[PDB]
RNA sequence: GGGAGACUUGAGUGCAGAAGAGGAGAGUGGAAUUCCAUGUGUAGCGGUGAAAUGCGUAGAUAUAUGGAGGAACACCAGUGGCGAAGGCGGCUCUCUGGUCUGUAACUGACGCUGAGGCUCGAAAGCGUGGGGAGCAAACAGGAUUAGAUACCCUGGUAGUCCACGCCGUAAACGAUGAGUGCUAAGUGUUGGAGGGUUUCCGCCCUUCAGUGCUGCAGCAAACGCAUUAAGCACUCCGCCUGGGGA
C-alpha cells in the first residue's frame, strides 16, 4: 500500500526527502517481505509469487551487506529497529 | 475503496411489491457489510437472448457500490443472491 | 478504421448492446479485428465486454 | 594485380588429386591439380585445374595460377614479421628466421615459400593439412605481411621512428 | 556488467575501424586518455578531443585512413585482463610485429610504448598490442 | 590491492503512468458428448479398403422435451501476450509476483557471475482420499495376414480430473549459459513515450522495451548466423577430449 509505504519511508528516512537509502529500502522491503509471507502461508501453492518473495529477500540481504560494509553503526541501529538477525 | 457495478436480472413476473422489498433487501445487505451504495436503479425489462432458469424476459437492476476489497459486502451479496428465487442471475464487476 | 478509437470511447460497457452488436457476426460469433479494423487493445476489451454480455443474456451465445 | 608477363615464372605441382563423379554408367574419374607458380623473386601464385589426364590438368592449373599472382614482402632472405594465415581448416604460422637457417616448413607451404623466393623462414601448420587449404592459408598470411616503409608512410613517420 | 573498460575502448576502436567510421566516442578515463594519446603520437589515429560532461567526460577519437582508405590500424589486442593480469620485466618487454607495431605498457614512469619502456630499462603491466 | 574522501552514468528507491492466457483461492456460464426419463416413430443402426464383432422388435438409430454428471473452454486467436523455465486461453471476484515507459526527487557501485546448497520443474508413474462424461495403456472380441502378441474395427480397466504428499525425468530445444558494451540497412507487429500536422478520427517524424521477417560487414567445414549474432570484446559458471563396452 502506498500509504503504508510512505509512512515507513518517513519513519526511517535518513533525512528530509530521503526515499533511497539502505535504511529506507530495507525497512520497506521488510514490511513487504512480512506481508508476502502471510500471503505465502495462506497460498502455499502460489509458487510464482514465492519467487518474488525470494528476490525481495536477496535484495534485502544485499542492501544489508552494503550497509554493514559501509557503516556498521548504522547497520546495528537499523536491524534493531526492524528486528532482523 | 474499490468501485463495483452489480447488475442482476429479476424474474419478469415478480410483483411490484415483492420487487421493492427485494431491491431494498439487497441494498441493506451491502450497507450492513461495510459498503456504500452510491446508487441502485432499475435499468430495463428486456427479452433474454436465451432461456435463463426458464425465463425469456427479465428486469435488469444495476447497483453501483463502493467498499474496501477486504469487506464482505460483495461476497455476502453473491451468497444471498444465488439462493434467492427472484434473482435469476447477477454479475459483479469492478469499474473505474 | 478502428471504430472504437474513432468514436473516442475509452470505456466499453458490456451493457452497450448497440456498440457490441457491430462486432459480432451472423450466428453471433466474435469477428476478427482484421475484419472489423479495431486495434489490438480495443479488440481485447471488446471480447471481454461481449463475453460478459453473453453471460448476462444481453447477447446470444449461438444463433 | 601482378602482370604475369615480364616475369620468368616457374611451376611446381603441389598435389595431383584423382576425383570421381558418380554417373549412371559407373564413375567419371578426373584429375584435379594444384600448382604453385612463382618467379622466386617475391611473386608467387597458385591455381587449380581439372582434366581427364594429368598433363592437361596441370596446364589449366598453371594458367590459373599465373592470373592470380601476389607479391610477398621480403626482408633479405626472410619475411618482415610473424604472420598467421587462416583459410578454412588450414592455419599456417610463419616467422622470420635467421640467415641461413633454411625453409623450416612442411607440406605445400614449402612450395609457396620456395617459389616466392623466401630462403629462411620458420613455419608451423596448425590446422588441417588438406593441400588446397594450406596453400590458401599461406597466401592469406603472406598478404598480411607489411613493409616498414609502407607502415611508416601510413603512420606519418620515418622508418627509424617506427623502429 | 562491464568489467574491462580498457578492453571496451580497444574493441570500440576495432569495430569502428572495421567499418571505417570517421570518428568514435567513449566514456573517459585517465588510462583511456593515456592510450589515446599514445595512438595519437605514434601515428595510428588522426586526432583526439576531450569533452567535459556531467558523468565522467567523453573522449572522441578520429580514426585515420591512408590513400585508398587503407586502414592504418590493423588490429588491437588486450593483453593484461581482469581475469589474468600480465606483467613483464624490463628484459621481457615485447616487440610487436618486430617493431612495426607497439605495445602500450603501464609503468611507474607512466603509460608508455614498448620502445620507451626498454629505453628506460623498466617493465610493467602490458595493456595492449597495437599494429 | 589496502586506507580516507568525492562522484552519478551501473544498480536500486521515490513519484507518475502502461499492458498482460503470470500465479493462488472461491464461485460461475454456455456449447457439446454420454447416461437417464418421457413422447413420436419403425427396421435397421454402427463400422471398413472391403467386412464382421457390436447395438436394435425386451422398440434401436433418428427426433422432441426435460434431468443428472464429468471434462474441456468454439468465435475472439494473431512468428499475439505473460512467465525463470516447466508453462498459462470461458467469465466474475479476493489475495499475489514480475515486467515495461516517462520523470530525475533520493541512495551513492549497494554490481555481475555463482561451485556447494536450496527452490521450482511437461507427461508418464507412485501413495492416501474423492471423482469418472469423453478418451484410452492393459485387456476382450472382430478383422488383416504366411504368422500379427500390430497397424484397422467394436468394446474397455488403470490413467487422464480434484485434494494432499512423493517422484525429478523429456528432441525439459533456439538441440545456441548468464551479464555488459560495441558493430550497415529494410519491413511487419505488441506495450509505451515525446513532437508536427490533422476539426477529431488519423497521419508524419523521434524514441524506449519486446516480438518476427529480409539482409551487409564480419563469422562459419558447410549449412547458415547477422543489434533477439553463431560478429567484435571483457567477467563468472557449466561442460567436451575417437567409437563401442556405458
Ligand atoms: C533410354 N536410353 C538410355 C538413355 O539414353 C540414357 N541417358 C538418359 C543413356 O545413358 C547412358 O548414355 C549413360 O550415360 C550411362 C549408361 C549406363 O547408359 C547409357 O545409355 C543410356 C541409354 O540406354
Ligand atoms: K438466484
Ligand atoms: K500487477
Ligand atoms: K493417482
Ligand atoms: K520493432
Ligand atoms: Mg576458384
Ligand atoms: Mg500427471
Ligand atoms: Mg537430461
Ligand atoms: Mg527490435
Cβ separation D162–E99 shorter than 8 A: yes
Report which of B94, B67, B68 is spatially closest to residue A1, judged by C-alpha positions: B68
* B70 contacts B32 by C-beta, under 8 angstroms: no
**Structure determined by:** cryo-EM
Q: If you search the block for the grid coordinates 556498521, which residue do you land on?
A: A72
Question: Hey, what's the cell of A75?
Answer: 547497520
Q: Which residue of B has its CA nearest to C13?
A: B95
Nucleotides of F under 7 A from a protein CB: 8-16, 19-25, 27-31, 66, 74-78, 80, 83-86, 90-98, 105-112, 114, 119-121, 164-165, 179-184, 189-192, 200-203, 217-218, 220-222, 231-236
Are the C-beta atoms of residues D83 and D101 closer than 8 Å to each other?
A: no
Indicate if CB(B3) is under 7 A from strand F: no
Q: b/e for E1-36, b at 16 or more Cβ within 10 A?
A: eeeeebbebbebbeebbeeeeeebebbbeeebbbbb
Find, among C22, C55, D81, the residue nearest to E95 by Cα: D81
Coil/strand/helix, residue B44: strand
Report the chain D residue with the minimal C-alpha distance to residue E40.
Answer: D155
Q: Where are the alpha helices (DSSP H) in E19-109?
A: 30-41
Q: Which nucleotide is nearest to C27 (CA to C1')?
A: F75
Q: Using CA atoms, how far apart are residues B45 and B56, in angstroms rounded to an integer? A: 11
Give the closest nucleotide to E2 (alpha carbon vs C1'). F180
Q: What gap in Å lies between CA E122 and CA E104, rounded to an integer?
A: 13
As a whole number of angstroms, the distance between CA C20 and CA D59 comes to 83
**Do D69 and D43 meet the contact criterion of CB atoms below 8 Å apart?**
yes
Closest residue by CA, ligand 1 atom 4: D24
Q: Which residues pair with E77 in a beta bridge?
A: E129
3-state secondary structure of D116: helix
How far, in Å, CA of A65 to CA of A42, rounded?
Answer: 31
Ranges of H-type helices in D19-158:
54-66, 108-116, 131-142, 148-155
Amino acid at each position: 500500500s502506498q500509504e503504508r509505504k510512505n509512512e515507513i519511508i518517513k519513519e526511517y528516512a535518513r533525512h528530509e526527502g530521503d526515499t533511497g537509502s539502505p535504511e529506507v529500502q530495507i525497512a520497506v522491503l521488510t514490511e513487504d517481505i512480512n506481508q508476502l509471507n502471510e500471503h505465502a502461508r495462506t497460498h502455499k501453492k502460489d509458487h510464482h509469487s514465492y519467487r518474488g518473495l525470494m528476490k525481495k529477500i536477496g535484495h534485502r540481504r544485499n542492501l544489508l551487506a552494503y550497509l554493514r560494509k559501509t557503516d556498521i553503526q548504522r547497520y546495528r541501529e537499523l536491524i534493531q529497529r526492524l528486528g532482523l538477525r | 475503496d474499490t468501485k463495483y457495478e452489480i447488475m442482476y436480472i429479476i424474474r419478469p413476473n415478480i410483483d411490484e411489491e415483492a420487487k421493492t422489498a427485494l431491491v431494498e433487501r439487497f441494498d441493506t445487505i451491502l450497507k450492513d457489510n461495510g459498503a456504500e451504495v452510491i446508487e441502485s436503479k432499475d435499468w430495463e425489462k428486456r427479452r433474454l437472448a436465451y432461456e435463463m432458469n426458464g425465463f425469456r424476459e427479465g428486469i435488469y437492476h444495476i447497483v453501483n457500490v463502493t467498499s474496501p476489497s477486504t469487506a464482505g459486502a460483495i461476497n455476502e451479496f453473491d451468497r444471498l443472491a444465488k439462493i434467492n428465487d427472484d434473482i435469476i442471475r447477477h454479475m459483479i464487476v469492478k469499474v473505474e | 478504421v478502428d471504430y472504437i478509437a474513432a468514436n473516442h470511447i475509452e470505456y466499453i460497457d458490456y451493457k452497450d448492446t448497440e456498440l457490441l452488436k457491430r462486432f459480432i457476426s451472423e450466428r453471433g460469433k466474435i469477428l476478427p479485428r482484421r475484419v472489423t479494423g479495431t486495434g489490438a487493445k480495443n479488440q481485447r476489451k471488446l471480447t471481454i465486454a461481449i463475453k460478459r454480455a453473453r453471460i448476462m443474456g444481453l447477447l446470444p451465445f449461438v444463433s | 594485380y601482378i602482370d604475369p608477363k615480364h616475369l620468368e615464372l616457374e611451376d611446381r605441382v603441389v598435389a595431383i588429386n584423382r576425383v570421381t563423379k558418380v554417373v549412371k554408367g559407373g564413375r567419371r574419374l578426373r584429375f584435379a591439380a594444384l600448382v604453385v607458380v612463382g618467379d622466386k623473386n617475391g611473386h608467387v601464385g597458385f591455381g587449380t585445374g581439372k582434366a581427364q589426364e594429368v598433363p592437361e590438368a596441370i596446364r589449366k592449373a598453371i594458367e590459373d595460377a599465373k592470373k592470380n599472382l601476389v607479391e610477398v614482402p621480403m626482408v633479405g632472405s626472410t619475411i618482415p614479421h610473424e604472420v598467421i594465415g587462416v583459410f578454412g581448416g588450414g592455419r599456417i604460422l610463419m616467422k622470420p628466421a635467421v640467415e641461413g637457417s633454411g625453409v623450416a616448413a612442411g607440406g605445400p607451404v614449402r612450395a609457396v615459400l620456395e617459389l616466392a623466393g623466401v630462403a629462411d623462414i620458420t613455419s608451423k601448420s596448425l590446422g588441417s593439412n588438406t593441400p588446397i587449404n594450406v596453400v590458401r592459408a599461406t597466401v592469406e598470411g603472406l598478404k598480411q605481411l607489411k613493409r616498414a616503409e609502407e607502415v611508416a608512410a601510413l603512420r606519418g613517420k620515418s622508418v627509424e621512428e617506427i623502429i | 556488467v562491464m568489467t574491462d573498460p580498457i578492453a571496451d575502448f580497444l574493441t570500440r576502436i576495432r569495430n569502428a575501424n572495421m567499418v571505417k567510421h570517421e570518428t568514435l566516442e567513449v566514456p573517459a578515463s585517465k588510462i583511456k586518455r593515456d592510450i589515446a594519446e599514445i595512438l595519437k603520437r605514434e601515428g595510428f589515429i588522426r586526432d583526439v578531443e576531450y569533452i567535459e560532461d556531467d558523468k565522467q567526460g567523453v573522449i572522441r577519437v578520429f580514426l585515420k585512413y591512408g590513400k585508398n582508405e587503407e586502414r592504418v590500424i590493423t588490429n588491437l589486442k588486450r593483453i593484461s585482463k581482469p581475469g589474468l593480469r600480465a606483467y613483464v620485466k624490463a628484459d621481457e618487454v615485447p616487440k610487436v610485429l618486430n617493431g612495426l607495431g607497439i605495445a602500450i605498457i603501464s609503468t611507474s614512469e607512466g603509460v608508455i610504448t614498448d620502445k620507451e619502456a626498454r629505453a628506460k630499462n623498466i617493465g610493467g603491466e602490458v595493456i595492449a598490442y597495437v599494429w
